[PDB]
Swiss-Prot record, chains A, B:
Result for mutant: G17V: In a colorectal cancer cell line; elevated kinase activity; efficiently induces cell transformation
Cellular compartment(s): Nucleus; Cytoplasm; Cell membrane
Tissue/organ expression: Brain and testis.
Residues of the full protein shown: 448 to 705 of 766
Illness: Defects in BRAF are found in a wide range of cancers. Colorectal cancer: A complex disease characterized by malignant lesions arising from the inner wall of the large intestine (the colon) and the rectum. Genetic alterations are often associated with progression from premalignant lesion (adenoma) to invasive adenocarcinoma. Risk factors for cancer of the colon and rectum include colon polyps, long-standing ulcerative colitis, and genetic family history.
Catalytic residues in the record: D129
Protein name: Serine/threonine-protein kinase B-raf
PTM statement from Swiss-Prot or TrEMBL: Methylation at Arg-210 decreases stability and kinase activity.
Positions bound to ATP: I16, G17, S18, G19, S20, F21, G22, T23, V24, K36
Record family assignment: Belongs to the protein kinase superfamily. TKL Ser/Thr protein kinase family. RAF subfamily.
Effect of E139K: In ovarian cancer
Amino acid sequence: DDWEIPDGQITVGQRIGSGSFGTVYKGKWHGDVAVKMLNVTAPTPQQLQAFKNEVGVLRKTRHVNILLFMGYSTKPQLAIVTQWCEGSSLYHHLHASETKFEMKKLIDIARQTARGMDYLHAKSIIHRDLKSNNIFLHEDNTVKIGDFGLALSGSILWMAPEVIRMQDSNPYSFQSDVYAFGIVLYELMTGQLPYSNINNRDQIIEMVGRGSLSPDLSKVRSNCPKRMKRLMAECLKKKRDERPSFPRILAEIEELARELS
Amino acid sequence: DDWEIPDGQITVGQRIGSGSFGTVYKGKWHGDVAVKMLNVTAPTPQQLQAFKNEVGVLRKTRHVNILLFMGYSTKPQLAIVTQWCEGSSLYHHLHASETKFEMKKLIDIARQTARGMDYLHAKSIIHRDLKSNNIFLHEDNTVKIGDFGLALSGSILWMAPEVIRMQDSNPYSFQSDVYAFGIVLYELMTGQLPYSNINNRDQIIEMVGRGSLSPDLSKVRSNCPKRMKRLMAECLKKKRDERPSFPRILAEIEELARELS
Ligand SMILES: O=C(c1c(F)ccc(NS(=O)(=O)c2ccc(C(F)(F)F)cc2)c1F)c1c[nH]c2ncc(Cl)cc12
Ligand SMILES: O=C(c1c(F)ccc(NS(=O)(=O)c2ccc(C(F)(F)F)cc2)c1F)c1c[nH]c2ncc(Cl)cc12
């Protein structure tokens, strides 16, 4: 279709790293781009169908807080091409650097993430893997939600109880996206990952599933707004249908951002 | 279609100003947006067809240096919705402020503009009205090429001789876009508009048409690269088909930017 980029047009550059189901490279195509070369070689009919479905979903996204899809390749192999983002992931800023954001900045990041998610859900798109390592801070300022996944057990902390239980075939929903966002809020407000005092991964899975273990909200920073702590608890509610939806989440965080400037 | 935004979803805010064929407003729709309400009321079949054509062209643009189309409205009236840009136009920075960009910055702006235009031309899209007032410096850093046109005779300085002559019905081409870009380069390197020492608009039109008047390239700044001055003269060549195309223009400006960092 019209988003297919013919072979030879993109000059592939530096190998950035192993992403989600592919290898990401910086590239040149009318400026800078990112190019994820999918791991699949000799794809089955169902792998080609799944690729076309995902391109179809990405084609429906036009929002500043969603990583900008730019095109795809078929030959010599499957690939997704997007805008190049400058900087690092939110995971890197929060958990792999000595940079400490001020509360105004943290709330701005929460607001922009909420803008992107509110947008996705309005178009009936479920992310399914929202987490800080899938949020990029383009130019250290603009949230870009995507599927970066750079260096699974590395999504366990963001999984809602119904997802982690896996008691049904498709537990992913708007509501489980909201829970994952609640964990992102926990990361922003505490600067930390949840359950850091438990060293057994299998026991985190079991306890989050049965509702005996939840994020310790007493660890939020002293200047985290009371309303943000309340909103976070709502997003993290163990019962799927007691969680808020994104229009309200966005509206409240937008007001928190407005008060800070 | 799937880019139509139902009425009631967008909260229309501040009136920004009269744009090209419409009135621009800041709005709220999953975050910030811009909304141009077209002037046309009770559109004819051909005005509705022209609107659908333009949305069709905007749908083909996914590039960081092209203003991000987000959707459109039909009722109660025709409207184009895009991302909201922070800051002001390149025209404002160069000709309506005492801010003076350094040469590194000027060349960065030229590079990003070239990225956007190279992209458009690769998809066979002719802008037809490239000028500094149609280039926005989003967050004072990122070029966004669009159709802003905020407060015609206000495109005369960017018109190639064949356009200004109007000796045929459709003188707009990739090549006339390149000429307009050459005038944008003149704006960046001199900080000025061409022909400022002539106070008669009708005489500018006649002389640019017959090739007796061209931009005074001796006014470029002392630290404007010799290669940029040469490239600019090539873009401004009076004969349509002696001008370069954007792949080469982009490559050369990219190298100028690379040397400066
Ligand atoms: O890792 C990626 C990447 C990529 F190369 C291709 C595709 C994606 N994600 S994506 O498949 O297009 C995507 C998936 C889901 C969504 C959403 F948000 F659900 F809509 C948006 C985008 C990436 F995150 C990067 C894209 N731009 C970058 N800039 C810098 C770096 Cl270090 C990585 C990247
Ligand atoms: O003036 C506009 C505007 C708008 F409201 C609607 C549409 C457009 N342009 S556009 O029709 O979508 C458009 C037209 C042509 C192109 C291109 F580049 F040819 F592809 C891209 C975009 C605007 F420039 C602004 C868009 N975002 C803004 N942010 C701030 C301000 Cl002050 C104005 C605006």
